[PDB]
Amino acid sequence: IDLGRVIGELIDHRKLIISITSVFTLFAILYALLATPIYETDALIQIEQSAPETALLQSRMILGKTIDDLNLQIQIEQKYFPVIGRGLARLMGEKPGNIDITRLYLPDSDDISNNTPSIILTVKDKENYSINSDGIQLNGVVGTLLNEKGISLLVNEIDAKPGDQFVITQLPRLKAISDLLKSFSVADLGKDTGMLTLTLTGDNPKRISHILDSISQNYLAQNIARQAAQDAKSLEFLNQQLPRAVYLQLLNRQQELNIAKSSAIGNVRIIDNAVTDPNPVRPKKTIIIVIGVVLGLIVSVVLVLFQVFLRRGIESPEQLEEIGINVYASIPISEWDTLLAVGNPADLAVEAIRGLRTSLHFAMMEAKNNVLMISGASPSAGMTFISSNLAATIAITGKKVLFIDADLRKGYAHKMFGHKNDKGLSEFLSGQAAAEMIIDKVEGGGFDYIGRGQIPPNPAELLMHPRFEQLLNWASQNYDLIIIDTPPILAVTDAAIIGRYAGTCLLVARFEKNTVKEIDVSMKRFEQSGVVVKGCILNGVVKKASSYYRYGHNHYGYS
Amino acid sequence: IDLGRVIGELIDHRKLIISITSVFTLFAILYALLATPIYETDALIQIEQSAPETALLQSRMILGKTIDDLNLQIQIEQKYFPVIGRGLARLMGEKPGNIDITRLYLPDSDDISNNTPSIILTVKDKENYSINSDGIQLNGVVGTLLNEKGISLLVNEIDAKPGDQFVITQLPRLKAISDLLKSFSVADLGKDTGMLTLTLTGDNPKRISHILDSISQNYLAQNIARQAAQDAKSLEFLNQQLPKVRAELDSAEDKLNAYRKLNMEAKSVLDQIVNVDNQLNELTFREAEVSQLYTKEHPTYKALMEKRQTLQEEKSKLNKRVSSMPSTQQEVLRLSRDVESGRAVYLQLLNRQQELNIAKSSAIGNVRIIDNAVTDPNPVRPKKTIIIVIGVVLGLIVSVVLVLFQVFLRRGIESPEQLEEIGINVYASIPISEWDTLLAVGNPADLAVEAIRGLRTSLHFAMMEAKNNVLMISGASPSAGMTFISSNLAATIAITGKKVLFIDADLRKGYAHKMFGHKNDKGLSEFLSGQAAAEMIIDKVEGGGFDYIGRGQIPPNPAELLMHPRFEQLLNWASQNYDLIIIDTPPILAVTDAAIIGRYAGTCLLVARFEKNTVKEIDVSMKRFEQSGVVVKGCILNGVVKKASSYYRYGHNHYGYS
Ligand SMILES: Nc1ncnc2c1ncn2[C@@H]1O[C@H](COP(=O)(O)OP(=O)(O)O)[C@@H](O)[C@H]1O
Ligand SMILES: Nc1ncnc2c1ncn2[C@@H]1O[C@H](COP(=O)(O)OP(=O)(O)O)[C@@H](O)[C@H]1O
Ligand SMILES: [Mg+2]
Ligand SMILES: [Mg+2]
């Protein structure tokens, strides 16, 4: 392998690479435009340590106080049925509706798994709404409280368009604490300084800043409470100790303790209250799209290498000529039940077949007779295509040509020539016909033909009859060329039975399907049975860039 | 080897790989969905160090206090008879029942091995239940205690459906402490700070949180009792009664020694009373501590009074049992009661003194519980996804190593190229025919019969310029295909209008007459042994078109018969009346009949099985033939199957065309 080979393989497989890469980048683009944006807010706290403060911020005490204060155990999600409804709704420019709830109490089913009771609220207008838990429909109004069916509910300031639905859950307090704690982080930023960077990420730009403000204020109040606890305890002790100079001294001490208790500035300071960065931190569109593109490229490349390394078929006549097999032609694909050599005589395939005719006219001299047998290794290789078209192109040069279809199993020559299906080759071989009633005329051809007739039950045993050699000996005296079409040789043995009476034999090898070892096996099986193969004919050739950077063009158009 | 070879081997062995991987992933999935989930709970404590506190929390002192407090030495396990009953019971949605026990005293068998006595409790209803220890059935009621056969038991609040069974064990105190300590861990989380992170894992989400709460509150109560005990008279109290209790213990020991210088019920009631007295003493200490540090209406204090009443009732029943026994028994029982009570109280006072003394040296201020224990509802074990991934990967690697072992241990023939390297002309390759009848007659359009027609065409060219018209088909190993090929080839040569004779010269295990329809009388043997004529041995195949000669009766000297000149006379006579004679023979590596016959055969062909025979085996067979004067013309591969590795090595080499 070298640069030319790999560039050729990439050029040939360009459709696969483009399709796969386009699919992966389309998926990446859809994900990057439908993922819910996640905003981030941060605050700065000053400590006058910072190792225990980090663990005291993230404790259930402070976070639980925040949860209780802000009613964060009532979870409201606007209802979009699919996994992409929310993303497209955001893309279409619709602002997301929201409602405010201050009291919720569900009947607390608390079954084995569903520990979070949930309801669905449908908005009818700016004031009224409907509620359904499990099909139980109720009606409610903003303002007036609801206590029905073991459900207590209060909704205020419904801000949405009618028809919207909201899933409302009262997730348990510990679940709310864990949810908040997962999205809340603290950093030290100096490894020694009293500076703490508080961070909170969430999908609502205002609510996350409110939550972080509440957390910071709760922490500050708690810290000043601990700082003033000692002075408050001392003041309480003095109050319990008060029963004249000692009395005035105790009064002064009590006043000083009052001052210290009230001031109580702790060793904690809020430098920056939380504000939300307006640019979402996730999803990161550029890195997502780059990952998609690169993943598509590497997947396409590995798939191309697998296909290249698993390819076994023939690529050029050089492979066959290495083994010692003379390739007499290379017939390309004709992209145009009719003979090609009559419908479109100016086709490229018919030009290649004319080249084959010219090669044969020199290869078939010094042959024991004028019989040519075209066989092959595998079915659907092009044996009948080549035989019929070659007979057509040899017939127009003013020579008499006979085309015998000795494929007594799946032959369709009579269909492709226009037929009188009676009295084919079989009826002659089995004795129920004469040599003169089997020969017919091609309409747009100029050569005779003998069809297969009716499919016999013993094809290979019929061709062993001496009637076949009698027919060939009679026809060799009335015609200039006889072309016998045969079944494959790796499938049945009819070809090697017929090849005893054929002066010249040629195999047809399909371009990508057959293999060099397969053709070698076919020629060895012919030569083992007493039939000497003159050569091969590659078929179904297509132009490929890798063949250019390895072999060359080997074909042109000239019109 | 290359990519084509390995891909072919993987495609050929795909059934094995898929089956093994499926078994491994099924086992992994069953384990991951049947394993008992393990939850984790944690607590946060503030300490005004923390290196000695970590070690003091995990000491048998604190943990033993918790074990005695929560009665963790009573182990209750619901009974699912198989090792997978629990998992499927949980999956089917059955809530696992539980029972509450506050008093359990088994007779303490205390044998060599079973140091943990156990009983089985079967629930009858919400109120009644049944107990069996060793087949002895008893009936008990929630509420009232049971004191029978030296067994004390108290169950409250049976929450299960009738028919359930529970194994109840009183495992020893050190075993309970070790079990709790194994799953309980303490960390500092800062390596310097005053925060302690307490962690406890277990399979019951509520019980582990309760246990961790008890541990944290016991630590906090220890330190606050320490700070209170500076002016408390308890230290001097114990310092005063300790010599007094020691003197009373010495007096009791001396009295026991003087009286000394074994009834089963006697010692049973004795140790039961000893345990009751220990429980009353430790309960008095616990009541004093709780009343000092808690309120009367607190549920713990009420539970303490309830346990006190229960234990006093048990003691009264024990005294009633004592009063009914002979005086000589109860005298020694009282002696042992005094001695054991004195010893146990002495040890308890030493433990109390040590607890106070260790407390007073504590240098930590007031402890501040920040986070009480809560249980994480998501189990921390088992980790399902990693288990399933490990199962998949293990299955894949096991399948791959078995595939390489099978590939590397393969020695049979793979393609006619292996035979043709050595110089052995392979004349055919007959595939497996998946369809006692001739194949060439029942199913003439079969693939194998097409291959045999190819072989017939090859032979028609190889058998010219042969000294006569006799063909002998032999082989290297038995059950390779000598008779299959010989009989079918005779069938396919007979239909071309030629006269064929088929002689079954396998006088040992031949079955040609069976497969053709037979007149078993007058086979080849009876001709050779002189008791038959050449015309009475020849038969007709029904659906064939050729004659045959069967083996006849099995002779005891087959190899010596074929040397008699009658055989050559028969062949010479038959060669003038027939167009082809096909002789079937036994293998050559097994017997020597083939090489005796092969002298009169113009052409000889070996049959080589596809995967079974080996190239060395066929080489040895041809050399053993040529050593005896028989020139083997060639070989015939048989039983060929299509494999991907052959394609990515050689190619297809066979097709269907119909
Ligand atoms: N170079 C070719 N260009 C276009 N069609 C071809 C070419 N070669 C073969 N074919 C077509 O593909 C089919 C298979 O070829 P055919 O010769 O008829 O089968 P077989 O070789 O088994 O007898 C036919 O329909 C044929 O027309
Ligand atoms: N290509 C084949 N396809 C299916 N069955 C076969 C094939 N070759 C042999 N057999 C069957 O396997 C068995 C062994 O073959 P056989 O010729 O009877 O053994 P031997 O060569 O030792 O006399 C027989 O039952 C035969 O029918
Ligand atoms: Mg054809
Ligand atoms: Mg046999």
Numbering used by the authors:
A (entry chain B): 17 to 64, 85 to 279, 385 to 477, 494 to 716
B (entry chain A): 17 to 64, 85 to 297, 304 to 477, 494 to 716
Task: Provide the publication's sentences verbatim.
Wzc, an integral cytoplasmic membrane tyrosine autokinase protein serves as the master regulator of the biosynthesis and export of many bacterial capsular polysaccharides and exopolysaccharides. Wzc comprises a large periplasmic domain, two transmembrane helices and a C-terminal cytoplasmic kinase domain with a tyrosine-rich tail. Wzc regulates polymerisation functions through cycling the formation and dissociation of an octameric complex, driven by changes in the phosphorylation status of the tyrosine-rich tail. E. coli Wzc serves a model for a wider family of polysaccharide co-polymerases.
When Y715 occupies the active site (1pY), Y713 is bound in the same pocket. The structural and MD data reported here confirm this hypothesis, showing that the tyrosine most stably positioned at the active site is the one immediately N-terminal to the phosphotyrosine (or the engineered Tyr-to-Glu mutation). We show that it is binding of the i-2 tyrosine to the tyrosine pocket (where i is the number of the residue positioned at the kinase active site) orders the tail between the tyrosine at the active site and helix α23. During the progressive phosphorylation sequence, the kinase domain is a rigid body. Structural alignment of the kinase domains of monomers of the full-length protein reveals increasing tilting of the transmembrane and periplasmic regions. When the octamer is viewed from the periplasm to the cytoplasm, progressive phosphorylation results in a clockwise rotation of transmembrane and periplasmic regions relative to the kinase ring. The movement of helix α1 is directly transmitted to transmembrane helix α2 and then to the periplasmic domain and, in this way, the phosphorylation signal from the cytoplasm is coupled to the periplasm.
